[PDB]
Write an enzyme that holds these catalytic residues in place. Structure first.
Site, short mmCIF file in Angstrom:
data_model
loop_
_atom_site.label_atom_id
_atom_site.label_comp_id
_atom_site.label_asym_id
_atom_site.label_seq_id
_atom_site.Cartn_x
_atom_site.Cartn_y
_atom_site.Cartn_z
N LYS A 229 -9.17 -1.87 2.40
CA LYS A 229 -8.96 -0.55 2.99
C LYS A 229 -9.80 0.51 2.28
O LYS A 229 -10.36 1.39 2.94
CB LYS A 229 -7.48 -0.18 2.93
CG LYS A 229 -6.56 -1.19 3.57
CD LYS A 229 -6.83 -1.28 5.08
CE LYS A 229 -5.83 -2.20 5.78
NZ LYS A 229 -6.18 -2.29 7.24
N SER B 156 -0.64 -0.78 11.47
CA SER B 156 -0.05 -1.90 10.76
C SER B 156 1.32 -2.21 11.36
O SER B 156 2.02 -1.31 11.84
CB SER B 156 0.09 -1.58 9.26
OG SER B 156 -0.98 -0.76 8.81
N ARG C 278 0.84 -1.19 0.00
CA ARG C 278 0.00 0.00 0.00
C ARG C 278 0.89 1.25 0.00
O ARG C 278 1.93 1.26 0.65
CB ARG C 278 -0.88 -0.06 1.26
CG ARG C 278 -1.99 0.94 1.39
CD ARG C 278 -2.93 0.65 2.56
NE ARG C 278 -2.24 0.33 3.81
CZ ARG C 278 -1.61 1.21 4.58
NH1 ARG C 278 -1.51 2.49 4.23
NH2 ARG C 278 -1.06 0.80 5.73
N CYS D 96 2.00 -3.80 14.12
CA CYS D 96 2.02 -3.66 15.57
C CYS D 96 1.25 -4.77 16.27
O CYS D 96 0.99 -4.68 17.48
CB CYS D 96 1.46 -2.27 15.98
SG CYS D 96 2.61 -0.96 15.46
N1 LIG Z 1 7.62 -7.61 21.08
C1 LIG Z 1 6.43 -8.02 20.63
N2 LIG Z 1 6.19 -7.98 19.28
C2 LIG Z 1 4.99 -8.37 18.83
C3 LIG Z 1 3.98 -8.80 19.67
N3 LIG Z 1 2.91 -9.12 18.90
C4 LIG Z 1 3.22 -8.89 17.61
N4 LIG Z 1 4.52 -8.43 17.56
C5 LIG Z 1 5.30 -8.03 16.38
O1 LIG Z 1 4.42 -7.46 15.44
C6 LIG Z 1 4.84 -7.81 14.11
C7 LIG Z 1 3.73 -8.45 13.30
O2 LIG Z 1 2.66 -7.53 13.22
P1 LIG Z 1 1.82 -7.33 11.87
O3 LIG Z 1 1.15 -8.64 11.47
O4 LIG Z 1 2.81 -6.85 10.86
O5 LIG Z 1 0.69 -6.25 12.37
P2 LIG Z 1 -0.91 -6.14 12.05
O6 LIG Z 1 -1.51 -5.27 13.14
O7 LIG Z 1 -1.62 -7.47 11.96
O8 LIG Z 1 -0.82 -5.34 10.65
P3 LIG Z 1 -1.81 -5.20 9.38
O9 LIG Z 1 -2.39 -6.49 8.82
O10 LIG Z 1 -0.86 -4.62 8.38
O11 LIG Z 1 -2.94 -4.26 9.74
C8 LIG Z 1 5.98 -8.78 14.25
O12 LIG Z 1 7.11 -7.96 14.13
C9 LIG Z 1 5.86 -9.25 15.67
O13 LIG Z 1 7.14 -9.63 16.16
C10 LIG Z 1 4.20 -8.84 21.03
O14 LIG Z 1 3.32 -9.23 21.80
N5 LIG Z 1 5.43 -8.45 21.49
O1 LIG Z 2 -1.56 -1.90 5.94
C1 LIG Z 2 -2.38 -2.56 6.59
O2 LIG Z 2 -2.85 -2.28 7.70
C2 LIG Z 2 -2.90 -3.96 6.04
O3 LIG Z 2 -3.71 -4.63 6.69
C3 LIG Z 2 -2.33 -4.44 4.71
S1 LIG Z 2 -3.07 -3.74 3.22
O4 LIG Z 2 -4.39 -4.42 3.15
O5 LIG Z 2 -3.17 -2.29 3.47
O6 LIG Z 2 -2.12 -3.99 2.10
MN LIG Z 3 -4.47 -3.36 8.53
#
Ligand SMILES: Nc1nc2c(ncn2[C@@H]2O[C@H](COP(=O)(O)OP(=O)(O)OP(=O)(O)O)[C@@H](O)[C@H]2O)c(=O)[nH]1
Ligand SMILES: O=C(O)C(=O)CS(=O)(=O)O
Ligand SMILES: [Mn+2]
Ligand SMILES: [Mn+2]
Ligand SMILES: [Mn+2]
Length: 620
Positions: free
Chosen positions: A242, A284, A85, A286
Site C-alpha cells: 500500500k 477492502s 493496517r 468487499c
Molecule cells: N454476499 C456476497 N459477499 C461476497 C461476495 N464476494 C465476496 N463477498 C464477501 O466479501 C468478503 C471477503 O472480501 P475480502 O477478501 O475481505 O475483500 P478484498 O476486496 O479482497 O479486500 P483487500 O485484500 O483487503 O483489499 C467475505 O465476507 C465474503 O463473504 C459476493 O459475491 N456476495
Molecule cells: O486493506 C487492504 O485493502 C489490504 O489489501 C490489506 S493490507 O495490505 O492493507 O494490510
Molecule cells: Mn487491498
C-alpha cells in the site's frame, strides 16, 4: 572517510557486501545503520537457501510455527494490538497541506492525513535513534512489477523483522537480480522498524515485536521515502504494497501520466473464444479477491487472475489502457474463504504459504470462520489467541483480518500474461461496494465523465478491515480513501484528463452491488461464482450488444438480458428497483460530501454530473 571507526559498518555485514552495492544504496543502508544501530546487517539475495534459513531462524525463536499438514506452510500469531493496517496513524508529508488533501470547506478531511515536515522531524527523532539495537537490519532489494517492465519501479526496504523479509519474498520480486537491474538508477527508500530495541523494556506478547503506542506510517513523496515504525502487520510493514504501490505510486502516476489503483485485474474468455480484461475497484472486505479468482458457474466461460489488489495502468502509443499487477503474490483475507466462496484460493494456499492470525488444527492444518469444512473426530482447534477453542465459544478462532500470503505463480488460474512487461489491455472498469439498500445489482455509466463521477460517489457499509466498525455507510471514492498519495481533487482531474488523450480507447465503466438485501435482511443475489452472469452482460456491452435500458442512474440490463437460468428464484424487480426517494437522499449525501471534502479542487465536470443526476432523478 572517518577519523575513527564509527561510520563503516562492513564488519557487521553477515550476508553480502557493502562494497558491491550501488553508491546511493550503500549510503542509504549505512546512514540508517548509523542511526538505528543494528547489531548485524544482512543484505538479502532472494535465494531459496536464504529463505529456508530465515524460516528456520523464526521457528527457533518462536516467531512462526510450521503447519505440518501442508507443504512448506507456516503460521504467525501477532500481538492483538497489531492486527491491521491503521488509517489513523498513517500520514503524508508535503510542504503544503493542499498538495496532500483538498482544504475542506467546513470539516476535517477524510481524504488523507497531512503532517508538516517540522512535526515529522520531531516524530522521527522520538522513534528511530537506536531502535534496532541488538537486532539484524535486513536489506530487501525489490521490484514492483516484472523486472524490466516499463511500468516497474524498484525499492529498497530496510527492516528489523524477519517476518517482513519472508513476506516480501512472496509479495514482491526480491534479491540480487534487482540490485543488478537497479544499477545507479533511482529507487524508493523504505525504512521500517518494529520499534523494540533490545533489551526489551516491555514484554512481548505472542513473541510478536511491536510498539503500538508509537506506531506511525509516514510517506514523503518529494524525497521518495517511506518511513514506518511500530507495526509488523501487513500494509504497515510490507512497504511495497500500500505505501509504495498506491500512495507513493499514485503521486508518481500523476506526475508521469499513468494510474495506480486499488483494483483487481482479471481476464475473461467467453464460449466464442474471445477474451477481455477487466479491472475492478472495491474497498477492502468487499470481495476483490473472490472476483479475481472466480470459478464461473456459466458453462464455456473462463476467468483467469492477473492480480487481486493493485493495478498500475498507462495508455500506450496505440491508445489502449494497459495494466500490470505490480505484486508477486496474494495477501488475501482468510476468513470466509471456502471451497464454495473461493475454490481457486483453496488450491493455491496449500503450499509455500504464510498464514497470520488464523487458527491451527491439532493435525497441523488451518481453520477460520466460514471455511465450511468439517473436521475429523478427535481434531481440536487452537485459536489465533493461542488458546484451546470450541465452536461453542463466542470468540472467533481466527482474527477477522487474518491473512494468507501466497505466491501468485501457484494460482491454478493465474493468467498467462500476468508477468508480461507490456501489460494487459483493459476494456472495462468496475466499481462497487457494500450497499444493503437502494443500489441495483449492476449499471453502466453514461460516459467517461459520468463514470468518473460514479467512482467519486462510491459508498460502502463499514466492515472490519481498518479500525472502522458498525453498520454505517461511509464514502470511499474509487476504493482509494485510505490510499490517496495526493489531493483527491487533482486525482479526479487526472482521471478526467484521460478523455483528452489522442486515440485513447476509453474502457466502459460499470458499478456493481453484490450486497443488496431484502426486507428480511437476506441477500437478493447469490453472488460468488454466479457473478459470472453479471460479467457476461458487461462482456456483451463492451462488444456493443443492444442489451441495456436507460434509467436515471445509467444503463441497466434489459428484461431477459441477464442469463438467470438455474437461479429461477431471483427477485429481479427488487434487485434492479430504483426508488426516487432513495436516490434523492443519495444525491444529497454525495453533494454534501463533495462540497465539504473536495471544495475548491472539485473539477467542474464532476459538479456537472452531480447536477445532471439530480435533474434526472427529479424527473422521476
Ligand atoms: N454476499 C456476497 N459477499 C461476497 C461476495 N464476494 C465476496 N463477498 C464477501 O466479501 C468478503 C471477503 O472480501 P475480502 O477478501 O475481505 O475483500 P478484498 O476486496 O479482497 O479486500 P483487500 O485484500 O483487503 O483489499 C467475505 O465476507 C465474503 O463473504 C459476493 O459475491 N456476495
Ligand atoms: O486493506 C487492504 O485493502 C489490504 O489489501 C490489506 S493490507 O495490505 O492493507 O494490510
Ligand atoms: Mn487491498
Ligand atoms: Mn483481497
Ligand atoms: Mn472533456
Amino acid at each position: 572517510p572517518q577519523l575513527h571507526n564509527g561510520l563503516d559498518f562492513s564488519a557487521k555485514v553477515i550476508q553480502g557486501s557493502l562494497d558491491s552495492l550501488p553508491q546511493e544504496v550503500r549510503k542509504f543502508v549505512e546512514g540508517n545503520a548509523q542511526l538505528c544501530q543494528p547489531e548485524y546487517i544482512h543484505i538479502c539475495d532472494g535465494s531459496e537457501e536464504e529463505y529456508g534459513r530465515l524460516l528456520a531462524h523464526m521457528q527457533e525463536e518462536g516467531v512462526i510455527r510450521k503447519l505440518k499438514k501442508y507443504d512448506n506452510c507456516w503460521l504467525a500469531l501477532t500481538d492483538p494490538r497489531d492486527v491491521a493496517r491503521i488509517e489513523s496513524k498513517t500520514v503524508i508529508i508535503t510542504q503544503e497541506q493542499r498538495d496532500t488533501v483538498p482544504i475542506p470547506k467546513s470539516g476535517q478531511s477524510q481524504l488523507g492525513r497531512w503532517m508538516s515536515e517540522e512535526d515529522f522531524e520531531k516524530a522521527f527523532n522520538a522513534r528511530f535513534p537506536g531502535c534496532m539495537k541488538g537486532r539484524t537490519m535486513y536489506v530487501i532489494p525489490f521490484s514492483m512489477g516484472p523486472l524490466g517492465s516499463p511500468l516497474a519501479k524498484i525499492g529498497i526496504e530496510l527492516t528489523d523483522s524477519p517476518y517482513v523479509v519472508a513476506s516480501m519474498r512472496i509479495m514482491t520480486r526480491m534479491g540480487t537480480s534487482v540490485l543488478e537491474a537497479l544499477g545507479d538508477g533511482e529507487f524508493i527508500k523504505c525504512l521500517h522498524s518494529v520499534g523494540c530495541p533490545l533489551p526489551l523494556k516491555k514484554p512481548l506478547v505472542n513473541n510478536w515485536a511491536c510498539n503500538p503506542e508509537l506506531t506511525l506510517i509516514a510517506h514523503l513523496p518529494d524525497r521518495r521515502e517511506i518511513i514506518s515504525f511500530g507495526s509488523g502487520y501487513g500494509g504497515n510493514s510490507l512497504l511495497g504494497k500500500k505505501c509504495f504501490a498506491l500512495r507513493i505510486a499514485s503521486r508518481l502516476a500523476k506526475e508521469e501520466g499513468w494510474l495506480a489503483e486499488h483494483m483487481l485485474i482479471l481476464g475473461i474468455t467467453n464460449p466464442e473464444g474471445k477474451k477481455k480484461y477487466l479491472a475492478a475497484a472495491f474497498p477492502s472486505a468487499c470481495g476483490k479477491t473472490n472476483l479475481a479468482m472466480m470459478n464461473p458457474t456459466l458453462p464455456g466461460w473462463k476467468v483467469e487472475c492477473v492480480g487481486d489488489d493493485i493495478a498500475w495502468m498507462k495508455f500506450d502509443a496505440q491508445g489502449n489502457l494497459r495494466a500490470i499487477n505490480p505484486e508477486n503474490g496474494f495477501f488475501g483475507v482468510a476468513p470466509g474463504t471456502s471451497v464454495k466462496t473461493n475454490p481457486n484460493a483453496i488450491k493455491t494456499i496449500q503450499k509455500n504459504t504464510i498464514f497470520t492470525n488464523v487458527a491451527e488444527t491439532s493435525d497441523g492444518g488451518v481453520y477460520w470462520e466460514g471455511i465450511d469444512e468439517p473436521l475429523a473426530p478427535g481434531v481440536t482447534i487452537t485459536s489465533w489467541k493461542n488458546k484451546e477453542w470450541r465452536p461453542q465459544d463466542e470468540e472467533p478462532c481466527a482474527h477477522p483480518n487474518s491473512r494468507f500470503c501466497t505466491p501468485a505463480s501457484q494460482c491454478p488460474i493465474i493468467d498467462p500474461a500476468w508477468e508480461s512487461p507490456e501489460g494487459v489491455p483493459i476494456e472495462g472498469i468496475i466499481f462497487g461496494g457494500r450497499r444493503p439498500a437502494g443500489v441495483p445489482l449492476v449499471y453502466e455509466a453514461l460516459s467517461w465523465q459520468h463514470g468518473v463521477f460514479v467512482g467519486a460517489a462510491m459508498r460502502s457499509e463499514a466492515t472490519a478491515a481498518a479500525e472502522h466498525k458498525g453498520k454505517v455507510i461511509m464514502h470511499d471514492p474509487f476504493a482509494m480513501r485510505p490510499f490517496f498519495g495526493y489531493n483527491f481533487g487533482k486525482y479526479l482531474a487526472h482521471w478526467l484528463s484521460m478523455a483528452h488523450r489522442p486515440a485513447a480507447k476509453l474502457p466502459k465503466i460499470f458499478h456493481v452491488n453484490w450486497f443488496r438485501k431484502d426486507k428480511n435482511g437476506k441477500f437478493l443475489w447469490p453472488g460468488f461464482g454466479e457473478n459470472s452472469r453479471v460479467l457476461e452482460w458487461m462482456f456483451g456491452r463492451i462488444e456493443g450488444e443492444d442489451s441495456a435500458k436507460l434509467t436515471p442512474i445509467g444503463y441497466v440490463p434489459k428484461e431477459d438480458a441477464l442469463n438467470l437460468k438455474g437461479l429461477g428464484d431471483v427477485n429481479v424487480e427488487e434487485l434492479f428497483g430504483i426508488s426516487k426517494e432513495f436516490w434523492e437522499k443519495e444525491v444529497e449525501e454525495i453533494d454534501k460530501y463533495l462540497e465539504d471534502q473536495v471544495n475548491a479542487d472539485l473539477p467542474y465536470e464532476i459538479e456537472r454530473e452531480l447536477r445532471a443526476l439530480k435533474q434526472r432523478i427529479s424527473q422521476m
